[PDB]
mmCIF file with all atom_site columns, C-alpha atoms in Angstrom:
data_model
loop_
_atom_site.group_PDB
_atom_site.id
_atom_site.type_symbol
_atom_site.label_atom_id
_atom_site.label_alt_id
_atom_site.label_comp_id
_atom_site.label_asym_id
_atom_site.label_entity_id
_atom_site.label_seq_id
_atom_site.pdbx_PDB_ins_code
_atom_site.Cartn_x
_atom_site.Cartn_y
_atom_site.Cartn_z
_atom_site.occupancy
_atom_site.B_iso_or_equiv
_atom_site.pdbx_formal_charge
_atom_site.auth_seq_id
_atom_site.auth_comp_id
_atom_site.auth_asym_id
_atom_site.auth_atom_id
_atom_site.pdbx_PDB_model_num
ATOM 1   C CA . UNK Q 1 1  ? 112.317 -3.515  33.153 1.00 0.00 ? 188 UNK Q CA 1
ATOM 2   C CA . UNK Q 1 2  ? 113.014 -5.340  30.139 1.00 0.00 ? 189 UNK Q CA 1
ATOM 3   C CA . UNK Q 1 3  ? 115.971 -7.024  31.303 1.00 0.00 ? 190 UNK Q CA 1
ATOM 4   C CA . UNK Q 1 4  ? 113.396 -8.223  34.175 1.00 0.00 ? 191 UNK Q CA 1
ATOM 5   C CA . UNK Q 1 5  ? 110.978 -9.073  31.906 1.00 0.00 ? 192 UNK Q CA 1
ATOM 6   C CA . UNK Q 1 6  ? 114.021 -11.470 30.284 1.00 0.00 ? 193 UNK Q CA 1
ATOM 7   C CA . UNK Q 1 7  ? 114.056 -12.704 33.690 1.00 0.00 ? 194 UNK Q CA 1
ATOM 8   C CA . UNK Q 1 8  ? 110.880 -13.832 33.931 1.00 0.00 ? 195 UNK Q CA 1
ATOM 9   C CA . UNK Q 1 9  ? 110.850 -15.651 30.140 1.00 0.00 ? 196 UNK Q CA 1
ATOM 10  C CA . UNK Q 1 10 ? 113.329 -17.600 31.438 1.00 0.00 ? 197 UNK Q CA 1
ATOM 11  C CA . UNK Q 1 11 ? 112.203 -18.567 34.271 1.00 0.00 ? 198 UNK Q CA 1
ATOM 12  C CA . UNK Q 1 12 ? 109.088 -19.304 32.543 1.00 0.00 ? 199 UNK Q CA 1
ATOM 13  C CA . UNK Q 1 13 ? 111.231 -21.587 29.914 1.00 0.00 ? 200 UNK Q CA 1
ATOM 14  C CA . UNK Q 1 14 ? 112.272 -23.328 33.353 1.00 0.00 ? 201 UNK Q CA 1
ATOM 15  C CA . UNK Q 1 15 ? 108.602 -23.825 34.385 1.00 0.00 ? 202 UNK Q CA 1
ATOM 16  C CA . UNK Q 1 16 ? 107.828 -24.991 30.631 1.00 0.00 ? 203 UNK Q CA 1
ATOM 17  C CA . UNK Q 1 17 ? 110.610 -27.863 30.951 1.00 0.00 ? 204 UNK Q CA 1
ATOM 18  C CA . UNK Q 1 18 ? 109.358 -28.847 34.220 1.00 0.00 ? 205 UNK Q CA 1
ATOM 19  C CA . UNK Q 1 19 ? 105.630 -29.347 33.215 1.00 0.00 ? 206 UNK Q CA 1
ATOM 20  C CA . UNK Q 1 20 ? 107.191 -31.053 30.226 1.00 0.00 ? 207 UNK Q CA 1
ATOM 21  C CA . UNK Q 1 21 ? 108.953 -33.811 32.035 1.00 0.00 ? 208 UNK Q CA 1
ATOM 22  C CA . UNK Q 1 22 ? 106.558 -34.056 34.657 1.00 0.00 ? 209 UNK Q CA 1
ATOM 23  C CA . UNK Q 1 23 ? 103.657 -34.682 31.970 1.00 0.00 ? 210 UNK Q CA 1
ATOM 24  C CA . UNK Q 1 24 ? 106.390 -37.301 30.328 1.00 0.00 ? 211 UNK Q CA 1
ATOM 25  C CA . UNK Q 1 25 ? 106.561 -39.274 33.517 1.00 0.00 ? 212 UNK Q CA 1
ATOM 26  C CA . UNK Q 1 26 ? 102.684 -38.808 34.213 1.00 0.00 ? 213 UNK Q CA 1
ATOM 27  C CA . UNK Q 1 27 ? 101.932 -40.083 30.562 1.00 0.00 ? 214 UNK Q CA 1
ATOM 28  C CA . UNK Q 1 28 ? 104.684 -43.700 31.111 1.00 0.00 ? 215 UNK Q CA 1
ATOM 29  C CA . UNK Q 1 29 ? 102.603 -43.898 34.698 1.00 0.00 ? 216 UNK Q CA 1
ATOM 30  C CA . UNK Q 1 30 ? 98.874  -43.594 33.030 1.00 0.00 ? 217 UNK Q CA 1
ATOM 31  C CA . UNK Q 1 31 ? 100.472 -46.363 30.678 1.00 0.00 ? 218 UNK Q CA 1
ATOM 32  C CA . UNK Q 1 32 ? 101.464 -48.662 33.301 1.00 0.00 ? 219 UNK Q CA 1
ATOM 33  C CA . UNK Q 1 33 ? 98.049  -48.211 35.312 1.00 0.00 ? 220 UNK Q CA 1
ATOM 34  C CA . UNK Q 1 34 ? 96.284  -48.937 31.702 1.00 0.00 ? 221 UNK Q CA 1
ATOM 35  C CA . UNK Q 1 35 ? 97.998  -52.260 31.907 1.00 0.00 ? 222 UNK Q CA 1
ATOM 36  C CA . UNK Q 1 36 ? 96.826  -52.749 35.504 1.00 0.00 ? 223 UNK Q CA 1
ATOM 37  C CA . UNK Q 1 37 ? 93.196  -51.920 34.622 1.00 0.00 ? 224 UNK Q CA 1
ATOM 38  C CA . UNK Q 1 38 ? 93.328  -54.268 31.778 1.00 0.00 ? 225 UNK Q CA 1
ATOM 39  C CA . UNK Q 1 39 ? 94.698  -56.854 33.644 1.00 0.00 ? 226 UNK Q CA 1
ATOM 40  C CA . UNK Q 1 40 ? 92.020  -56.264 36.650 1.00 0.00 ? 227 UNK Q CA 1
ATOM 41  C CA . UNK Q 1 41 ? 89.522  -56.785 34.249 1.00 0.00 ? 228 UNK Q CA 1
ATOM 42  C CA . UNK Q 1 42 ? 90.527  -59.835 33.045 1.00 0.00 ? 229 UNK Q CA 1
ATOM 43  C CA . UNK Q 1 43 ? 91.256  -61.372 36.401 1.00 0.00 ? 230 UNK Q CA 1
ATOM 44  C CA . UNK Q 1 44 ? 87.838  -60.106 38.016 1.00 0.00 ? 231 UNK Q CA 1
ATOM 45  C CA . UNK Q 1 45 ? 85.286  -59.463 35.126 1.00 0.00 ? 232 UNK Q CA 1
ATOM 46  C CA . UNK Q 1 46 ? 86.079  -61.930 32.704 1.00 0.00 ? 233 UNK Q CA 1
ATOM 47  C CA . UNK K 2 1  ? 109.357 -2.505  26.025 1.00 0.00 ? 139 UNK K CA 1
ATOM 48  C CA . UNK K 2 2  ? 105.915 -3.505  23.155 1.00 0.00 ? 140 UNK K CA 1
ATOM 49  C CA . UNK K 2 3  ? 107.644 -6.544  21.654 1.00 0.00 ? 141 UNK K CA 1
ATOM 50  C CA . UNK K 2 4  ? 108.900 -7.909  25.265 1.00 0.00 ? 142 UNK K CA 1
ATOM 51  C CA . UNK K 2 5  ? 105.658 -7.663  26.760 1.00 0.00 ? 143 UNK K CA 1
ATOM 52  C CA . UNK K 2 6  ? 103.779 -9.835  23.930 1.00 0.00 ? 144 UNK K CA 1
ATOM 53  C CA . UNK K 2 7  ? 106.904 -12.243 24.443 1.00 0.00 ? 145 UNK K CA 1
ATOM 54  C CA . UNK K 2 8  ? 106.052 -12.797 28.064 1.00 0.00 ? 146 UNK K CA 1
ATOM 55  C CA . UNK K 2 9  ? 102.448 -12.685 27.270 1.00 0.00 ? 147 UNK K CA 1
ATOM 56  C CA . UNK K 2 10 ? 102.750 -15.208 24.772 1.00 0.00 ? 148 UNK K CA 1
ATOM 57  C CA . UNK K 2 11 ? 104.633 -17.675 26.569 1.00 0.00 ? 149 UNK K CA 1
ATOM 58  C CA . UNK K 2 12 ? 102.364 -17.239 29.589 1.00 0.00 ? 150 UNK K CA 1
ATOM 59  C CA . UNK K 2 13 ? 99.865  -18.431 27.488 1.00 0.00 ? 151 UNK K CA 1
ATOM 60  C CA . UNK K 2 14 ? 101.305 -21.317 26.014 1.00 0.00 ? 152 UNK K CA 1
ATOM 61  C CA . UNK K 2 15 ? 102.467 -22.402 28.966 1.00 0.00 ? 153 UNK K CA 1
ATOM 62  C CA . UNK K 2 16 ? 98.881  -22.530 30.561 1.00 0.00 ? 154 UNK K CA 1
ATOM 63  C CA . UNK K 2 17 ? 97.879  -24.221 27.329 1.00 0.00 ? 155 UNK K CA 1
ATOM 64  C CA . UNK K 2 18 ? 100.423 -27.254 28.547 1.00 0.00 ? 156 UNK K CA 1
ATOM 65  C CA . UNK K 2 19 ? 99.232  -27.060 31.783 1.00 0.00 ? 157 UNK K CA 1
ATOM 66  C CA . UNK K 2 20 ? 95.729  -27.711 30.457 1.00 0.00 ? 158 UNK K CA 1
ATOM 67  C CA . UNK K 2 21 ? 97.185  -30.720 29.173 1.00 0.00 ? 159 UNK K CA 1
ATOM 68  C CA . UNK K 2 22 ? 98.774  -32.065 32.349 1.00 0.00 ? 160 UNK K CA 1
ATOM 69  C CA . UNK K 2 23 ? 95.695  -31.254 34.005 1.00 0.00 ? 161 UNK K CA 1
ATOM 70  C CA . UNK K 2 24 ? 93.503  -33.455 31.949 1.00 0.00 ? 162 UNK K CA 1
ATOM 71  C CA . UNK K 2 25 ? 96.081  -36.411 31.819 1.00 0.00 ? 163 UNK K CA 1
ATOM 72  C CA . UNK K 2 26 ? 95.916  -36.207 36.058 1.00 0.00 ? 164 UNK K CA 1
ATOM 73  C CA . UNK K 2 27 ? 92.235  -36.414 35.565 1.00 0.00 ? 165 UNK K CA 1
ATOM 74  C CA . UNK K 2 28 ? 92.637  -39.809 33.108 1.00 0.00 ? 166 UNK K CA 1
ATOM 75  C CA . UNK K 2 29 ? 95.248  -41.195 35.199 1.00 0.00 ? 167 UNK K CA 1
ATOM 76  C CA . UNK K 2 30 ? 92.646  -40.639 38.554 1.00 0.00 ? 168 UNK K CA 1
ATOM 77  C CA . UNK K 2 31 ? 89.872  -42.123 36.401 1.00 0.00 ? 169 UNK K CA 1
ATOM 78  C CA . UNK K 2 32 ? 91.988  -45.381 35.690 1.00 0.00 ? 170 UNK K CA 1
ATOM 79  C CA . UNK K 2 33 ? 92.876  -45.716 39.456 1.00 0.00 ? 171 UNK K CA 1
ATOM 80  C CA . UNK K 2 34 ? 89.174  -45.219 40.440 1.00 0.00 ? 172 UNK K CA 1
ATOM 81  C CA . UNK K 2 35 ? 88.300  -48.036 37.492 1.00 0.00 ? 173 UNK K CA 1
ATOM 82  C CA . UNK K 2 36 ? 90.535  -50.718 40.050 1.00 0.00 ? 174 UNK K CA 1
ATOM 83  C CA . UNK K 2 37 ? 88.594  -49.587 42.758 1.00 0.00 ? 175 UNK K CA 1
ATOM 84  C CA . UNK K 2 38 ? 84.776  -50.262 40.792 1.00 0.00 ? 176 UNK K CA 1
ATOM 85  C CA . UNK K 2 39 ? 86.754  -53.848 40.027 1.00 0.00 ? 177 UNK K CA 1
ATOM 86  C CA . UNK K 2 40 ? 87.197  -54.778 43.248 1.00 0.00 ? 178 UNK K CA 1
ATOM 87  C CA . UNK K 2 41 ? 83.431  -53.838 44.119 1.00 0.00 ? 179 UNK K CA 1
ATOM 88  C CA . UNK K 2 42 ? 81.619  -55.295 41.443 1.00 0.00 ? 180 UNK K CA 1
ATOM 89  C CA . UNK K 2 43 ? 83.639  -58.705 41.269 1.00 0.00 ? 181 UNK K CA 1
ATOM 90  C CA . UNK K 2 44 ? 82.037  -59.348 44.754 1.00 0.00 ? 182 UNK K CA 1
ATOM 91  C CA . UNK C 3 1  ? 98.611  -53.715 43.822 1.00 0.00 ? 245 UNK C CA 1
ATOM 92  C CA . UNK C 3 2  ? 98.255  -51.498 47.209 1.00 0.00 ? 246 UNK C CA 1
ATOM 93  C CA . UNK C 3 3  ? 100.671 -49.221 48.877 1.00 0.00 ? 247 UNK C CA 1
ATOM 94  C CA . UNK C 3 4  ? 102.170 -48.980 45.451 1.00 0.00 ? 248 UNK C CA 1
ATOM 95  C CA . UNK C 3 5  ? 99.087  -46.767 44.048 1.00 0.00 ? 249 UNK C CA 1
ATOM 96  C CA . UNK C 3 6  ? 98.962  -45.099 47.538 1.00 0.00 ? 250 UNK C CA 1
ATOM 97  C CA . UNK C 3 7  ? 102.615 -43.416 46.564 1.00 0.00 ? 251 UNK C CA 1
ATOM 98  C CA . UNK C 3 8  ? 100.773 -42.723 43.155 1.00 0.00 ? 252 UNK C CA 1
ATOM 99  C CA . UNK C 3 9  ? 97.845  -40.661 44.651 1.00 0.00 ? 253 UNK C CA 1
ATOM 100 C CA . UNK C 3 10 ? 100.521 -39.004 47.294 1.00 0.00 ? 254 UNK C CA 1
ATOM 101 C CA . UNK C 3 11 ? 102.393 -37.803 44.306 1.00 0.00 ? 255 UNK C CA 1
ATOM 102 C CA . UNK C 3 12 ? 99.216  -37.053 41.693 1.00 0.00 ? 256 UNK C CA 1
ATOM 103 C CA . UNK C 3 13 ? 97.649  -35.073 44.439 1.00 0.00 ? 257 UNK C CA 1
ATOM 104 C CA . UNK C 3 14 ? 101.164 -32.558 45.418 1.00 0.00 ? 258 UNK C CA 1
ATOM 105 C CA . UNK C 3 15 ? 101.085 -32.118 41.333 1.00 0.00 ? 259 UNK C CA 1
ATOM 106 C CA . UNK C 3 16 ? 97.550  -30.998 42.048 1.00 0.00 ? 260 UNK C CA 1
ATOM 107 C CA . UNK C 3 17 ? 98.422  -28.244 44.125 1.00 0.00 ? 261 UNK C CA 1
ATOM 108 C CA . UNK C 3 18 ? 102.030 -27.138 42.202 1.00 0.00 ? 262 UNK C CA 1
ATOM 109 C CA . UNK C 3 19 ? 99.815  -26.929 39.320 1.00 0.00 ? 263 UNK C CA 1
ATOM 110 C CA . UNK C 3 20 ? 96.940  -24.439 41.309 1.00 0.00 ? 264 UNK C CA 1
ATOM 111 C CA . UNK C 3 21 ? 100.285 -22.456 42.938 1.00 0.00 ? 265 UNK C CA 1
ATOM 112 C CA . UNK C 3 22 ? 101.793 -22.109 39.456 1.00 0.00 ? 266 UNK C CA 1
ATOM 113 C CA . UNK C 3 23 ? 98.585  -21.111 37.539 1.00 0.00 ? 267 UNK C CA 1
ATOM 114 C CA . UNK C 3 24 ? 97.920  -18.440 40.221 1.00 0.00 ? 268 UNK C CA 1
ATOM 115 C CA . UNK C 3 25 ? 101.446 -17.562 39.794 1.00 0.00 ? 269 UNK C CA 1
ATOM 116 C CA . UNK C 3 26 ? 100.632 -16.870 36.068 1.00 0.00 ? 270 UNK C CA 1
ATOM 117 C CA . UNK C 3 27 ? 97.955  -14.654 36.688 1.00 0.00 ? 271 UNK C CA 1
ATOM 118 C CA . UNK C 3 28 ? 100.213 -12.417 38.323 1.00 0.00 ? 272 UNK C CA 1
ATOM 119 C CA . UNK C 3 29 ? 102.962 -12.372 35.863 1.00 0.00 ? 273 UNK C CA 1
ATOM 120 C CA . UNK C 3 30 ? 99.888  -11.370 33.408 1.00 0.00 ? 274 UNK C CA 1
ATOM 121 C CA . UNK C 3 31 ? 98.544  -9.171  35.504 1.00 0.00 ? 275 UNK C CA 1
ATOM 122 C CA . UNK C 3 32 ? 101.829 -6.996  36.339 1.00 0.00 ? 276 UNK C CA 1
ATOM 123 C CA . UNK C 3 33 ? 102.167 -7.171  32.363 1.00 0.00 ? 277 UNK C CA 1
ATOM 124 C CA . UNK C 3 34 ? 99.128  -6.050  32.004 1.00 0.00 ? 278 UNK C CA 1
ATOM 125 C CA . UNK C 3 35 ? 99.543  -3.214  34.292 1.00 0.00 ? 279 UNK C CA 1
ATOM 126 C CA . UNK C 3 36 ? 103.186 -2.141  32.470 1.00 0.00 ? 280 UNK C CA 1
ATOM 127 C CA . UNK C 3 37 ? 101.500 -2.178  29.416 1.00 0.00 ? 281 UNK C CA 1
ATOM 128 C CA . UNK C 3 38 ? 99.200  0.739   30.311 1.00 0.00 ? 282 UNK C CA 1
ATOM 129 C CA . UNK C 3 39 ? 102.031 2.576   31.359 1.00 0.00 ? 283 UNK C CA 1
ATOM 130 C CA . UNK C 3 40 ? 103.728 1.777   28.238 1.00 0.00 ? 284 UNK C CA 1
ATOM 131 C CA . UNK C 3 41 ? 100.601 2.570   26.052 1.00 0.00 ? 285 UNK C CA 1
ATOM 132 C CA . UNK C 3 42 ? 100.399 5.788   27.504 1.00 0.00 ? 286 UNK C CA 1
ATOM 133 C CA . UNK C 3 43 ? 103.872 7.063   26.925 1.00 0.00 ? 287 UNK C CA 1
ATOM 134 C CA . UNK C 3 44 ? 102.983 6.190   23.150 1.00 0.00 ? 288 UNK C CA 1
ATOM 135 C CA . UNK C 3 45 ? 100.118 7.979   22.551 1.00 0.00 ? 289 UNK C CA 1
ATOM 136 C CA . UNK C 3 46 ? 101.443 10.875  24.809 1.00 0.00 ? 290 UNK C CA 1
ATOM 137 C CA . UNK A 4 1  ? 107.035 -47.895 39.111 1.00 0.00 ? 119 UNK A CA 1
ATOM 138 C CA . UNK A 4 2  ? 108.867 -47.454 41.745 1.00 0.00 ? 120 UNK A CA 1
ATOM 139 C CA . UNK A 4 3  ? 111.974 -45.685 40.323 1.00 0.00 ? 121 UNK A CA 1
ATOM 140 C CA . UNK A 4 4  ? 109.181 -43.549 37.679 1.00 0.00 ? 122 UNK A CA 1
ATOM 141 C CA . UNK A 4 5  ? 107.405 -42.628 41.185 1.00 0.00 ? 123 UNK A CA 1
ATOM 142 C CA . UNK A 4 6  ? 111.458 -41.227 42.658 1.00 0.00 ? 124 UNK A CA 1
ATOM 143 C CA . UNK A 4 7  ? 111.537 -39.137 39.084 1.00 0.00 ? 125 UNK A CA 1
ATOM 144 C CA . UNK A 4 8  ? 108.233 -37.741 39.677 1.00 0.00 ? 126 UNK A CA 1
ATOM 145 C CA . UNK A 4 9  ? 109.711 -36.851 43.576 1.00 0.00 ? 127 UNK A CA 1
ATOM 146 C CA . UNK A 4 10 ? 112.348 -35.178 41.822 1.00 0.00 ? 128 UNK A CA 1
ATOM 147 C CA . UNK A 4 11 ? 110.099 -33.056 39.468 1.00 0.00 ? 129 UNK A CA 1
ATOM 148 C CA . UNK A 4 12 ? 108.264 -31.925 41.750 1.00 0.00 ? 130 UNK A CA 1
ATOM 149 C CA . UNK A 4 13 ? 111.081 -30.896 44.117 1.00 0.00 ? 131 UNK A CA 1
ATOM 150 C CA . UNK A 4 14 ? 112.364 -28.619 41.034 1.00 0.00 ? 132 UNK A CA 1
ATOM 151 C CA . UNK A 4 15 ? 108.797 -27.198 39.924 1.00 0.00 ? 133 UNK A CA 1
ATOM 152 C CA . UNK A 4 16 ? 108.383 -25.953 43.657 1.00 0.00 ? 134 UNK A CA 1
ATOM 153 C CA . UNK A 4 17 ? 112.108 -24.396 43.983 1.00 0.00 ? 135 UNK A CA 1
ATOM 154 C CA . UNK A 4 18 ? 111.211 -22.723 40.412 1.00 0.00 ? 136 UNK A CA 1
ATOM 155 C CA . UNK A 4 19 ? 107.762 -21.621 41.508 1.00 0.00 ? 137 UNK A CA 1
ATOM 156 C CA . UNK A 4 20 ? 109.454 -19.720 44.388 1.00 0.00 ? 138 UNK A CA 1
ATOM 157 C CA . UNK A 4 21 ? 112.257 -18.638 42.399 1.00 0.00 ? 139 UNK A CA 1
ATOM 158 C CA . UNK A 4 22 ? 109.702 -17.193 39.681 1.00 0.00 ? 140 UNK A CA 1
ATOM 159 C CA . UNK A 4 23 ? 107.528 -15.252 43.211 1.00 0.00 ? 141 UNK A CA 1
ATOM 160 C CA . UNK A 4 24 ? 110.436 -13.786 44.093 1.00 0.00 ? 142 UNK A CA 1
ATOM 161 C CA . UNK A 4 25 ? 111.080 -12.331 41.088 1.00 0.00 ? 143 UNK A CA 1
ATOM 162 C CA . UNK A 4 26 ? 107.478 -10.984 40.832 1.00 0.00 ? 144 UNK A CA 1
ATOM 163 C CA . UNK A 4 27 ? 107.567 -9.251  44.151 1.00 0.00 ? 145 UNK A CA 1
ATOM 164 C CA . UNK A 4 28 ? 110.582 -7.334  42.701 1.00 0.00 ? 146 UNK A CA 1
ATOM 165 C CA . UNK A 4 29 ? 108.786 -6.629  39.783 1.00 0.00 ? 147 UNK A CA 1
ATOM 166 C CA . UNK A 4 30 ? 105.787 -5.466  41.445 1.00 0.00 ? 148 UNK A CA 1
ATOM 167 C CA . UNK A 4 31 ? 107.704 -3.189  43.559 1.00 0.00 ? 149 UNK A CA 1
ATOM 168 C CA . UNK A 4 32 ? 109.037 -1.648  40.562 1.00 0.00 ? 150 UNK A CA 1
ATOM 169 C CA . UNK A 4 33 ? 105.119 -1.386  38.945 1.00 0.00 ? 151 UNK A CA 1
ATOM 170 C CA . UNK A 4 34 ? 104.595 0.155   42.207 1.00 0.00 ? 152 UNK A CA 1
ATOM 171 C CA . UNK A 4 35 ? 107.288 2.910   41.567 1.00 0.00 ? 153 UNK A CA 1
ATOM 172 C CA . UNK A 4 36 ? 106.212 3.362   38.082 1.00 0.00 ? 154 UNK A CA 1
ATOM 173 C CA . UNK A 4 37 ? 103.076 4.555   39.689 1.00 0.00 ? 155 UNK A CA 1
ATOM 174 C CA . UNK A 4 38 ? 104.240 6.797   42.533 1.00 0.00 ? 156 UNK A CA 1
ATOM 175 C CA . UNK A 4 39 ? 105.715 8.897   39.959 1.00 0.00 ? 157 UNK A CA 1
ATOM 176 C CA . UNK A 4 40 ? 103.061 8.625   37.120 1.00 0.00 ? 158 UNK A CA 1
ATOM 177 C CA . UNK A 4 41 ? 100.223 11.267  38.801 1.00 0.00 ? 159 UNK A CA 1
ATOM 178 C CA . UNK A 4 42 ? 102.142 13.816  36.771 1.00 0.00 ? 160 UNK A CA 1
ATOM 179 C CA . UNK A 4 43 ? 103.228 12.160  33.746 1.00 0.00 ? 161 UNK A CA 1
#
């Protein structure tokens, strides 16, 4: 079992990276939809 | 078999902790789309 | 911006439900640790 | 964006092959659990 359970932690590590790099590339995209909103605002509010 | 257990169960927990995370930056990065929309409305 | 966004929400929204599949995946790592800890437990105090 | 939004594409295509990879293991384990307990009614 515990050379399953090793299994699973590394799998898990796997998952870990993947979140990581996902949240990574979510956190450049919120960036570039910040600019967007600012720019919005200036176009259509101001 | 103790000590493996609490390793899983420990990184298990972190790794819902940094879910969490990804979770709330989805809802920010929905909020900031939603923001265009209410633009787009209000201008006219 | 348009279509552009529409890819955005496409992708934000299949995160959505990896996320919901990987949490409940999770639960039932924790849950079959959970359960090999009894067993464990009860070879110790045996 | 566009190339950020491919990226993301490709994330996601690895999270869900790991996702599966990471069930399969679990049924395997489970089966085992279920083992453990077939042969736990006497100790």
């Amino acid at each position: 079992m515990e050379k399953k359970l090793e299994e699973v932690k590394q799998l898990l590590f796997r998952l870990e990276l993947d979140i990581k790099e996902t949240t990574d590339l979510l956190r450049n995209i919120n960036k570039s939809i910040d600019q967007l909103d600012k720019y919005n605002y200036a176009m259509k509010i101001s």
